[PDB]
C-alpha cells in the first residue's frame, strides 16, 4: 500500500487547491537574518492566545478577507503551530465555543456546514492531523482495495480519453452510452533489459497504454520517483520489420474535416504479446472513440458497477463508523466537547447535535479522504476514477444525513438507510465509550507534534502570515489598541516591530 509520509498527507490537506511552502522566501540575502529574526518573534507572538483570536477575528471581518483566505490562513496557522498542538486545540476549543454561542442565536443545525470560515477549516486540519494514524492502522486498507478495484474495472473497458467517459462507471454522465467494441491485448512491456506483460485494450490511446505499461513497469515504486510519462516514447519492435515509435498524433493519424482522431493500438495494428519498449525522448479537434456531443441498459451497467464494487465499500463505510474498535481518543475528545456544547446552551435536540458531528467528521475528514485518494496514497487518479469515488462519497454524506433523482440515490437506494443506521450507532458509542482525560488527550497532542520527519514549512507559513498583517496592518493595530490587555501586554507595539524587522 502506497501510503503518503504524515507531511506529504498533510500539504495536500492543509493545501488542496495546489505545496505553496515548498518556495524560497525571496527576501535579499542581506536582509534574510532581520526578516527570518522578525519571523521567529511573529512566531512568539502568535503563542499569546489574545493575540491569536484578535487577528483571527480582526482578518474575518475584512471583507476582501475571502473564503480561499480564511481556510489558507487557517492552514498556515496549522503549520505555524504544529509543534504546540495542545494551544492549537485550546484556540480551537475557544473558537468552536464562540461559533456555538453565535449560531444558537441563528440556526444551529446550519453550524460547520462548510470549509468557508477559519475554524471550519482548524477543524478539517485537526481531525487530519489527529486520524493520520487510524487512516494508517485501519482505513487505509479498504480504502485502497477501493481504489485499486475502481481501477482494475475502470481498465477492463474503454475510456474515451477526449471526452472522459467510461464503459464501466457509476454516473450515467460519464456512461459511454454508444456501446463501443474493443479488443483485450497483452502487451510484453520492456524499459529500454528484460520483458514484464501488461493488459492493455486495442481501443487505447498510445498516453492510455503508456499509463498502463508505467505502472506495472514500475510496480512497487512511488509516482514522486517516477520519470515524467512525456520523457518517455513508445517504442513497438517486432523481429524482422524496424523499431516504430507510437503516439496519439503522427503522419498516420485518421483526419477528416475539422476532425481528428487519436491514434490507438488498434489504429497501428499492434498484434495480443507484441513487444513494446519505453524509450527516452488549427480548429481541428480531436476525437478518440466517440465525437463529443435512464435505460434499463444504462442503469443495469452501473448498477452492475455499483454490484462489483459493493463488498469494497461496505467494507470501507464499516471500518470508518465501526464499533468494534477503540474509538481514536481525538474523536471521542471532540464529540464529548460537542455534547458539553450543546449541554450548556440548552440544546437539548438531537438532530441538530447529530448534524453537528457529521459535520466536524464525516462530512470534513472521511468524505475528503473518499474523494480525494491522493490525500492519503502516492497515487494518481483520473476524472472517471474521480466521478465514481463522488457518487460513493455522496452515499457516505447520504449516510450521515436525516433527510429521508441523483444517481448516487438510485445505485444506492437499498443501502443508505442501512448506512445511517451504522452511522446513529457509531454517534451513540463515541458518547458511551470511556472519556478521554485531559492528560491522555494532551500526552496524544504532543506526540501528534514530532512523531513524523520532514518541514511542513513553517519559516514559509510565517512569512505568508505575514504578507496578510501588513495587507491589512492598520486594521489589526487599530483592533490591539483598542482592546485593553492588549495594550497592557504590548501586543500592538510587537507587532510593530515585527513589522519593521520584516521591512
Same mark, same amino acid.
Not at 474509538?327 to 446552551?345: R, S
Not at 438507510?417 to 470511556?434: F, G, L, N, S, W
Given at each position: 500500500?502506497?501510503?503518503?509520509?504524515?507531511?506529504?498527507?498533510?500539504?495536500?490537506?492543509?493545501?488542496?487547491?495546489?505545496?505553496?511552502?515548498?518556495?524560497?522566501?525571496?527576501?535579499?540575502?542581506?536582509?534574510?537574518?532581520?526578516?527570518?529574526?522578525?519571523?521567529?518573534?511573529?512566531?512568539?507572538?502568535?503563542?499569546?492566545?489574545?493575540?491569536?483570536?484578535?487577528?483571527?477575528?480582526?482578518?474575518?471581518?475584512?471583507?476582501?478577507?475571502?473564503?480561499?483566505?480564511?481556510?489558507?490562513?487557517?492552514?498556515?496557522?496549522?503549520?505555524?503551530?504544529?509543534?504546540?498542538? &495542545?494551544?492549537?486545540?485550546?484556540?480551537?476549543? @475557544? *473558537?468552536?465555543?464562540? %461559533?456555538? /454561542? +453565535?449560531? =444558537?442565536?441563528?440556526?444551529?443545525?446550519?453550524?460547520?456546514?462548510?470549509?468557508?470560515?477559519?475554524?471550519?477549516?482548524?477543524?478539517?486540519?485537526?481531525?487530519?492531523?489527529?486520524?493520520?494514524?487510524?487512516?494508517?492502522?485501519?482505513?487505509?486498507?479498504?480504502?485502497?482495495?477501493?481504489?485499486?478495484?475502481?481501477?482494475?474495472?475502470?481498465?477492463?473497458?474503454?475510456?474515451?480519453?477526449?471526452?472522459?467517459?467510461?464503459?464501466?462507471?457509476?454516473?450515467?454522465?460519464?456512461?459511454?452510452? &454508444?456501446?463501443?467494441?474493443?479488443?483485450?491485448? @497483452? *502487451?510484453?512491456?520492456? %524499459?529500454? /533489459? +528484460?520483458? =514484464?506483460?501488461?493488459?492493455?485494450?486495442?481501443?487505447?490511446?498510445?498516453?492510455?497504454?503508456?499509463?498502463?505499461?508505467?505502472?506495472?513497469?514500475?510496480?512497487?515504486?512511488?509516482?514522486?520517483?517516477?520519470?515524467?510519462?512525456?520523457?518517455?516514447?513508445?517504442?513497438?519492435?517486432?523481429?524482422?520489420?524496424?523499431?516504430?515509435?507510437?503516439?496519439?498524433?503522427?503522419?498516420?493519424?485518421?483526419?477528416?474535416?475539422?476532425?481528428?482522431?487519436?491514434?490507438?493500438?488498434?489504429?497501428?495494428?499492434?498484434?495480443?504479446?507484441?513487444?513494446?519498449?519505453?524509450?527516452?525522448?488549427?480548429?481541428?479537434?480531436?476525437?478518440?472513440?466517440?465525437?463529443?456531443?435512464?435505460?434499463?441498459?444504462?442503469?443495469?451497467?452501473?448498477?452492475?458497477?455499483?454490484?462489483?464494487?459493493?463488498?469494497?465499500?461496505?467494507?470501507?463505510?464499516?471500518?470508518?463508523?465501526?464499533?468494534?474498535?477503540?474509538?481514536?481518543?481525538?474523536?471521542?475528545?471532540?464529540?464529548?466537547?460537542?455534547?458539553?456544547?450543546?449541554?450548556?446552551?440548552?440544546?437539548?435536540?438531537?438532530?441538530?447535535?447529530?448534524?453537528?458531528?457529521?459535520?466536524?467528521?464525516?462530512?470534513?475528514?472521511?468524505?475528503?479522504?473518499?474523494?480525494?485518494?491522493?490525500?492519503?496514497?502516492?497515487?494518481?487518479?483520473?476524472?472517471?476514477?474521480?466521478?465514481?469515488?463522488?457518487?460513493?462519497?455522496?452515499?457516505?454524506?447520504?449516510?450521515?444525513?436525516?433527510?429521508?433523482?441523483?444517481?448516487?440515490?438510485?445505485?444506492?437506494?437499498?443501502?443508505?438507510?442501512?448506512?445511517?443506521?451504522?452511522?446513529?450507532?457509531?454517534?451513540?458509542?463515541?458518547?458511551?465509550?470511556?472519556?478521554?482525560?485531559?492528560?491522555?488527550?494532551?500526552?496524544?497532542?504532543?506526540?501528534?507534534?514530532?512523531?513524523?520527519?520532514?518541514?511542513?514549512?513553517?519559516?514559509?507559513?510565517?512569512?505568508?502570515?505575514?504578507?496578510?498583517?501588513?495587507?491589512?496592518?492598520?486594521?489589526?493595530?487599530?483592533?490591539?489598541?483598542?482592546?485593553?490587555?492588549?495594550?497592557?501586554?504590548?501586543?500592538?507595539?510587537?507587532?510593530?516591530?515585527?513589522?519593521?524587522?520584516?521591512?
Amino acid at each position: 500500500i502506497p501510503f503518503l509520509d504524515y507531511k506529504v498527507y498533510a500539504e495536500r490537506i492543509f493545501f488542496p487547491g495546489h505545496s505553496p511552502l515548498h518556495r524560497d522566501l525571496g527576501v535579499p540575502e542581506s536582509r534574510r537574518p532581520t526578516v527570518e529574526q522578525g519571523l521567529g518573534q511573529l512566531s512568539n507572538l502568535l503563542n499569546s492566545k489574545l493575540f491569536l483570536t484578535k487577528f483571527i477575528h480582526t482578518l474575518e471581518t475584512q471583507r476582501t478577507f475571502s473564503a480561499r483566505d480564511r481556510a489558507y490562513v487557517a492552514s498556515l496557522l496549522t503549520v505555524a503551530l504544529h509543534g504546540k498542538l &495542545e494551544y492549537f486545540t485550546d484556540i480551537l476549543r @475557544t *473558537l468552536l465555543s464562540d %461559533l456555538v /454561542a +453565535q449560531y =444558537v442565536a441563528k440556526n444551529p443545525k446550519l453550524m460547520l456546514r462548510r470549509t468557508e470560515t477559519v475554524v471550519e477549516k482548524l477543524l478539517t486540519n485537526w481531525m487530519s492531523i489527529c486520524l493520520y494514524t487510524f487512516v494508517r492502522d485501519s482505513v487505509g486498507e479498504p480504502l485502497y482495495m477501493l481504489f485499486r478495484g475502481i481501477k482494475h474495472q475502470v481498465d477492463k473497458g474503454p475510456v474515451d480519453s477526449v471526452t472522459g467517459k467510461a464503459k464501466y462507471t457509476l454516473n450515467d454522465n460519464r456512461l459511454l452510452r &454508444e456501446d463501443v467494441e474493443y479488443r483485450p491485448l @497483452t *502487451l510484453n512491456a520492456l %524499459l529500454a /533489459a +528484460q520483458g =514484464v506483460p501488461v493488459k492493455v485494450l486495442d481501443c487505447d490511446t498510445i498516453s492510455q497504454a503508456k499509463e498502463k505499461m508505467l505502472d506495472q513497469l514500475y510496480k512497487g515504486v512511488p509516482l514522486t520517483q517516477r520519470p515524467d510519462p512525456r520523457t518517455l516514447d513508445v517504442e513497438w519492435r517486432s523481429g524482422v520489420a524496424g523499431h516504430l515509435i507510437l503516439s496519439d498524433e503522427d503522419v498516420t493519424s485518421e483526419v477528416q474535416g475539422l476532425w481528428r482522431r487519436l491514434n490507438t493500438l488498434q489504429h497501428y495494428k499492434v498484434p495480443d504479446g507484441a513487444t513494446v519498449a519505453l524509450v527516452p525522448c488549427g480548429g481541428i479537434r480531436p476525437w478518440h472513440l466517440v465525437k463529443p456531443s435512464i435505460p434499463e441498459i444504462y442503469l443495469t451497467r452501473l448498477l452492475s458497477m455499483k454490484g462489483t464494487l459493493q463488498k469494497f465499500v461496505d467494507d470501507l463505510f464499516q471500518v470508518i463508523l465501526s464499533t468494534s474498535r477503540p474509538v481514536p481518543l481525538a474523536v471521542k475528545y471532540f464529540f464529548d466537547l460537542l455534547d458539553e456544547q450543546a449541554q450548556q446552551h440548552g440544546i437539548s435536540d438531537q438532530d441538530t447535535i447529530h448534524i453537528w458531528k457529521t459535520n466536524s467528521l464525516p462530512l470534513r475528514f472521511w468524505i475528503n479522504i473518499i474523494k480525494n485518494p491522493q490525500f492519503v496514497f502516492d497515487v494518481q487518479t483520473s476524472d472517471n476514477m474521480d466521478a465514481v469515488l463522488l457518487v460513493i462519497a455522496q452515499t457516505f454524506m447520504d449516510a450521515c444525513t436525516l433527510a429521508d433523482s441523483p444517481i448516487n440515490k438510485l445505485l444506492y437506494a437499498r443501502d443508505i438507510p442501512r448506512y445511517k443506521r451504522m452511522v446513529e450507532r457509531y454517534y451513540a458509542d463515541i458518547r458511551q465509550t470511556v472519556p478521554a482525560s485531559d492528560q491522555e488527550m494532551n500526552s496524544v497532542l504532543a506526540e501528534l507534534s514530532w512523531n513524523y520527519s520532514g518541514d511542513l514549512g513553517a519559516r514559509v507559513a510565517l512569512h505568508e502570515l505575514y504578507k496578510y498583517i501588513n495587507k491589512y496592518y492598520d486594521q489589526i493595530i487599530t483592533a490591539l489598541e483598542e482592546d485593553g490587555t492588549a495594550q497592557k501586554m504590548q501586543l500592538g507595539y510587537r507587532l510593530q516591530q515585527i513589522a519593521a524587522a520584516v521591512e
